Amino acid sequence: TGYLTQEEIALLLAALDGDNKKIAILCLSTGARWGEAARLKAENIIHNRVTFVKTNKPRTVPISEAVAKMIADGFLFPDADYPRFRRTMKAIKPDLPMGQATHALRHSFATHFMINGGSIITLQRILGHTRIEQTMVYAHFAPEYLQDAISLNPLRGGTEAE
Amino acid sequence: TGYLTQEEIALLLAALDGDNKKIAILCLSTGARWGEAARLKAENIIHNRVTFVKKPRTVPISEAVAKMIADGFLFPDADYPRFRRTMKAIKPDLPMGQATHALRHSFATHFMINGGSIITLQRILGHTRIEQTMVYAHFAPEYLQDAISLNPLRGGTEAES
Numbered sequence: 001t002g003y004l005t006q007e008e009i010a011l012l013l014a015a016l017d018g019d020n021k022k023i024a025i026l027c028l029s030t031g032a033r034w035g036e037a038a039r040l041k042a043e044n045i046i047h048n049r050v051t052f053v054k055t056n057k058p059r060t061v062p063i064s065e066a067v068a069k070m071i072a073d074g075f076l077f078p079d080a081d082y083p084r085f086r087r088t089m090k091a092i093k094p095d096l097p098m099g100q101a102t103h104a105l106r107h108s109f110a111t112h113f114m115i116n117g118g119s120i121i122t123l124q125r126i127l128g129h130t131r132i133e134q135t136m137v138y139a140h141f142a143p144e145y146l147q148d149a150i151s152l153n154p155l156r157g158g159t160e161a162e
Numbered sequence: 163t164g165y166l167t168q169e170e171i172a173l174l175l176a177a178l179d180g181d182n183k184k185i186a187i188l189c190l191s192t193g194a195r196w197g198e199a200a201r202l203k204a205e206n207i208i209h210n211r212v213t214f215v216k217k218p219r220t221v222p223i224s225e226a227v228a229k230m231i232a233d234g235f236l237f238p239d240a241d242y243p244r245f246r247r248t249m250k251a252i253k254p255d256l257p258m259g260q261a262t263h264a265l266r267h268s269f270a271t272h273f274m275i276n277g278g279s280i281i282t283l284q285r286i287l288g289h290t291r292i293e294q295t296m297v298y299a300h301f302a303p304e305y306l307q308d309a310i311s312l313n314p315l316r317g318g319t320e321a322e323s
């Protein structure tokens with residue numbers, strides 16, 4: 001449940017190349033596990049929407065034109081090399097627990113998603129978690145706004161309505 | 163269907179008066195149950211923050227609301243049965259004895275529809291466990307394109323410096 005800082009991300013991407021790099025970008029964009037991202041086919045990307053299939057239930061996550069352009073243009077990543085990815089990751093983040101390299105980028109997506117004001121519920125869906133309790137590992141990263149009781153109530157913080 | 167629409171709210175408030183109206187406004191603002199709102203005292207409102215006592219929890223309100231409800235017990239001329247009658251007239255299909263909670267559900271429901279956090283809602287409602295609050299989860303928009311803009315690459319292909 002560790003994650004990469006902004007600066008760790010920067011180093012990671014600088015140090016990777018080829019399909020590993022593209023996969024990293026995809027995982028950082030979508031919260032994909034390494035495996036499901038690496039096995040991805042052209043047909044799983046329709047109108048800038050990536051579909052990770054049934055194995056864990058299916059789920060779909062949108063990506064920018066730029067990302068879609070870069071990763072697509074059969075299997076998208078035939079020259080993926082997980083061990084080299086792992087090596088490079090461990091070099092940037094030495095304190096990373098064993099075999100957690102498959103999930104580090106997923107946890108980085110999630111973590112920054114919450115830090116940046118994302119909804120825990122939307123995140124649950126994006127990650128394809130069956131239960132919200134799974135997604136609550138990222139909850140403490142969220143800012144909390146009790147004054148939303150005022151502005152989001154159905155009177156909009158007033159006395160009237162509408 | 164468990165809660166009041168915007169238009170049902172409008173009718174309800176138009177049709178109530180006196181302390182009932184104020185209580186309704188308070189429940190719609192805070193997710194208060196009828197009872198805990200009706201039994202509220204001046205001392206439970208400090209700096210535009212309402213405290214519902216013994217599990218206790220505190221919920222902020224706008225100046226306007228505080229001004230209106232706090233000029234002892236705030237609502238000595240409350241009349242629940244009249245409230246109930248009026249509610250039933252606006253929303254006939256409302257389940258039995260649910261009139262005490264209809265406004266709490268409407269607060270919660272709109273809070274989520276309007277983009278509120280399920281976690282914050284948990285705290286506001288004073289739910290012990292998030293699972294209790296997940297009854298309102300399906301009302302949340304799921305703005306999947308936030309996967310793009312809230313990315314650690316900000317939807318791009320690369321890092322910043």
Ligand SMILES: [Zn+2]
Binds near residue numbers: 263
């Ligand atoms: Zn209830």
